[PDB]
Design a protein around this ligand. Structure first.
Ligand code: TUH
Length: 209
């Protein structure tokens, strides 16, 4: 069963801005998603400090980057704390309505789209490069769910039928036709070293074929 939800109006406006504004520095999406994964890995690590059983669903703490040129997807996988169904629905664990306000305003002061993460809504920068985003997630206290949106004002949530991931989150970017440079090994490597060099978890870039 698939449930369909309307985005809050501020978030719809944020996504419409990101999708349609001329902005060439689109590579920042990858910094924001890796940074979110790092935050989520810090969270399960912190929680395991007092309850080691929270790592029963997987002790490895890492980030995988999986390009697939045939499907034209770039997938970011982490083994962080994951998100519950209620988290997913409430703007993927973000305070997105106020963060959008503080952002879509701060733009009016002296601000650039690349500062989106300072306002807690860096995830939505995925729509600089993706026409659709699927978020598959598993939190210790809930089942595995898939969130999906092609923007246009709505998103869906469903129980996920794919492979069990134990614990963590998978962001599948269905790339725009003219954004396939982010499937290229050298380009992903360049972005990671430029923006993510001091992330404290191993980042594995998968190769293809
Ligand atoms: C939001 C996107 C989809 C995303 C979320 C999670 C996730 N799993 N468990 C969590 O708490 N988070 C998380 C982590 C950081 C965040 C929020 C909200 C705002 N910041 C700064 C939520 C992830 O591991 C990867 C991701 O790309």
């Amino acid at each position: 069963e698939v449930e369909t939800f309307a985005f809050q109006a501020e978030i719809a406006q944020l996504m419409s801005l990101i999708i349609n504004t001329f902005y060439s520095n689109k590579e920042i999406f990858l910094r924001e998603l890796i940074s979110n994964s790092s935050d989520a890995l810090d969270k399960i690590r912190y929680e395991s400090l007092t309850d080691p059983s929270k790592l029963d669903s997987g002790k490895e703490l890492h980030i995988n980057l999986i390009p697939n040129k045939q499907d034209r997807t770039l997938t970011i996988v982490d083994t962080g704390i994951g998100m519950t169904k209620a988290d997913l629905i409430n703007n993927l664990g973000t305070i997105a309505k106020s963060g959008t306000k503080a952002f879509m305003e701060a733009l009016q002061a002296g601000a650039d789209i690349s500062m989106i993460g300072q306002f807690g809504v860096g995830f939505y920068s995925a729509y600089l490069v993706a026409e659709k985003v699927t978020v598959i997630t598993k939190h210790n206290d809930d089942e595995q769910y898939a969130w999906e949106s092609s923007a246009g004002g709505s998103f869906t949530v469903r129980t996920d039928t794919g492979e069990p991931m134990g614990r963590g989150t998978k962001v599948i970017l269905h790339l725009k036709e003219d954004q396939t440079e982010y499937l290229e090994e050298r380009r992903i490597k360049e972005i990671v070293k430029k923006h993510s060099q001091f992330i404290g978890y191993p980042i594995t870039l998968f190769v293809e074929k």
